[PDB]
Write a protein that binds this ligand. Structure first.
Ligand SMILES: CC(C)CCC[C@@H](C)[C@H]1CC[C@H]2[C@@H]3CC=C4C[C@@H](O)CC[C@]4(C)[C@H]3CC[C@]12C
Ligand SMILES: CC(C)CCC[C@@H](C)[C@H]1CC[C@H]2[C@@H]3CC=C4C[C@@H](O)CC[C@]4(C)[C@H]3CC[C@]12C
Ligand SMILES: CC(C)CCC[C@@H](C)[C@H]1CC[C@H]2[C@@H]3CC=C4C[C@@H](O)CC[C@]4(C)[C@H]3CC[C@]12C
Ligand SMILES: OC[C@H]1O[C@H](O[C@H]2[C@H](O)[C@@H](O)[C@H](O)O[C@@H]2CO)[C@H](O)[C@@H](O)[C@@H]1O
Ligand SMILES: CC(C)NC[C@H](O)COc1cccc2[nH]c3ccccc3c12
Ligand SMILES: *C(=O)CCCCCCCCCCCCCCC
Length: 442
């Protein structure tokens, strides 16, 4: 009865604590560590600020409203508190929308995975977002455009103890469409093509980058020989400067044992080309390669990279089954390899590629593609937490009072609670994660 309201107070208090704590941690980590100061994370700050204000200024008074079963803060704060609520929700979806557009142009740019924005106009953009949100949110509420004209609403408006968001149908449609729906549809569309573009970036270079690894410094392979990039043997000589002489020769400058990622790609493309020409010479490998599609050809090249031509020609049964496009049967045999024993994970991806003829086994392996997924979860989680509430907004314009009020309020709180989710989702990122553990005296 009244023990339940103490318990509900505890829960709601923890919710308030969770939102403010996590979002302050995000804001702190980005502001403190220069590594985290990217154009993307500036928008995350804008996003964390909206959630923080939601935390401090919006949720406690909403919680007090429900527990006290009445509004005890007067009608100025009621209109002000309502304004901040709408603003924070509007600013969030707008910021999320800006991120999607920003990520789109960053991934379609010849200078990949970096914004077309300097840190300063990015700040400007954020300022404009908050200003547009303010104009969209604060203006209609304080200009009383939102208000309904029927008597029950007028009672609530005048009553200093009643804080209910009675709205006229013109506002309810327009406001919810402008604030929520317009940047939602844009965000969902734009970021869906962000994913398609990211998936399109997958090729044999990314494949071997994931399976083999890319080193910028000269290193020794398992047999002790000097190597660099993606398994590119420099020399069998035990002399380090012999390797460096060989490296400088191939790259075309004085490297001192260090090359760039793009330079490693140049070496890799040359190794791929050599691998293909050797395959076409090998009597046992040529018919298989000729029959295979582009993606599966990359899988076969992947194996030649790891085993050499002689090693791959050893699989006599698998090769003929690949040649006949009996993928599953080829998979059964390749899984019984010494190759699968020693490096099961890599073999698993290559074999799976042989089965589907797609790059699906290499999705979200790259650190950059994982980052895109985290942002995708942020957007999705926001959508799912707020969409039911905003659907009911429009449902009641069509036919009012079809949904019980305690359901409407509950949906609104699923929206509120979303403000505490984003900080936890950021723990997916390795950089945020260690940024957090430093900050927590760990
Ligand atoms: C308005 C009332 C209800 C809420 C209090 C607003 C506070 C939480 C907001 C308003 C202005 C915000 C800040 C504005 C300036 C930046 C610089 C950035 O590098 C880190 C975050 C930081 C420092 C913000 C964090 C918190 C902040 C101070
Ligand atoms: C409307 C009242 C109640 C709250 C004020 C909204 C605050 C939280 C908004 C208003 C202008 C915003 C900021 C505008 C400029 C930037 C610079 C960027 O580097 C970090 C975020 C930051 C700092 C924004 C987030 C926080 C911010 C300060
Ligand atoms: C009214 C309620 C919401 C106010 C509660 C304020 C709490 C959430 C604030 C007040 C002091 C804050 C902390 C102060 C000490 C640090 C260490 C720093 O490296 C990271 C942030 C961290 C961990 C803060 C996290 C949250 C914190 C505990
Ligand atoms: O056999 C052809 C390629 O072999 C090297 O790259 C191998 C390396 O031999 C091996 O130790 C390791 O396990 O795999 C890498 C690549 O997967 C060559 O130096 C390449 O240039 C050859 O194409
Ligand atoms: C307790 C109430 C005040 N909380 C409202 C939601 O948190 C935020 O709802 C909105 C956010 C952004 C734009 C909006 N337009 C609306 C029209 C009717 C109802 C809510 C909204 C709305
Ligand atoms: C290791 O970083 C983290 C330890 C930091 C301890 C700081 C102690 C903060 C105490 C919080 C009290 C503020 C409560 C405010 C209530 C209104």
């Amino acid at each position: 009865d009244e023990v339940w309201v103490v318990g509900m107070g505890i829960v709601m208090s923890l919710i308030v604590l969770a939102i403010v704590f996590g979002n302050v941690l995000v804001i702190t980590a980005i502001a403190k560590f220069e590594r985290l100061q990217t154009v993307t994370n500036y928008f995350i700050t804008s996003l964390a600020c909206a959630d923080l204000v939601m935390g401090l200024a919006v949720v406690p008074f909403g919680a007090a409203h429900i527990l006290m079963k009445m509004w005890t803060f007067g009608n100025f704060w009621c209109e002000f508190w309502t304004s901040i609520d709408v603003l924070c929700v509007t600013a969030s979806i707008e910021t999320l929308c800006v991120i999607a557009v920003d990520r789109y142009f960053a991934i379609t740019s010849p200078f990949k995975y970096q914004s077309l924005l300097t840190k300063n106009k990015a700040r400007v953009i954020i300022l404009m977002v908050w200003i547009v949100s303010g104009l969209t949110s604060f203006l209609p509420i304080q200009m009383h455009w939102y208000r309904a004209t029927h008597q029950e609403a007028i009672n609530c408006y005048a009553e200093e103890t009643c804080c209910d968001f009675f709205t006229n149908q013109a506002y309810a449609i327009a406001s919810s469409i402008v604030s929520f729906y317009v940047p939602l549809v844009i965000m969902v569309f734009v970021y869906s093509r962000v994913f398609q573009e990211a998936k399109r970036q997958l090729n044999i270079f990314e494949m071997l980058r994931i399976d083999e690894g890319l080193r910028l410094k000269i290193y020794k392979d398992t047999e002790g020989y000097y190597t660099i990039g993606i398994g590119h043997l420099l020399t069998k000589s035990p002399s380090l400067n012999a390797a460096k002489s060989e490296l400088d020769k191939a790259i075309g400058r004085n490297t001192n044992g260090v090359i760039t990622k793009d330079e490693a790609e140049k070496l890799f493309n040359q190794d791929v080309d050599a691998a293909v020409r050797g395959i076409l010479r090998n009597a046992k490998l040529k018919p298989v390669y000729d029959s295979l599609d582009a993606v599966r050809r990359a899988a076969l090249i992947n194996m030649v990279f790891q085993m050499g031509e002689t090693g791959v020609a050893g699989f006599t049964n698998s090769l003929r089954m690949l040649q006949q496009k009996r993928w599953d049967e080829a998979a059964v045999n390749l899984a019984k390899s010494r190759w699968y024993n020693q490096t099961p994970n890599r073999a698993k991806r290559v074999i799976t590629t042989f089965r589907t003829g797609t790059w699906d086994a290499y999705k979200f392996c790259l650190k950059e593609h994982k980052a895109l997924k985290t942002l995708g979860i942020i957007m999705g989680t926001f959508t799912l937490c707020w969409l039911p509430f905003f659907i009911v907004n429009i449902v009641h314009v069509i036919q009012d009072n079809l949904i019980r009020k305690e359901v409407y309020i509950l949906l609104n709180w699923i929206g509120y609670v979303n403000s505490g989710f984003n900080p936890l989702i950021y723990c997916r990122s390795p950089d945020f994660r260690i940024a957090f553990q430093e900050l927590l005296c760990l």
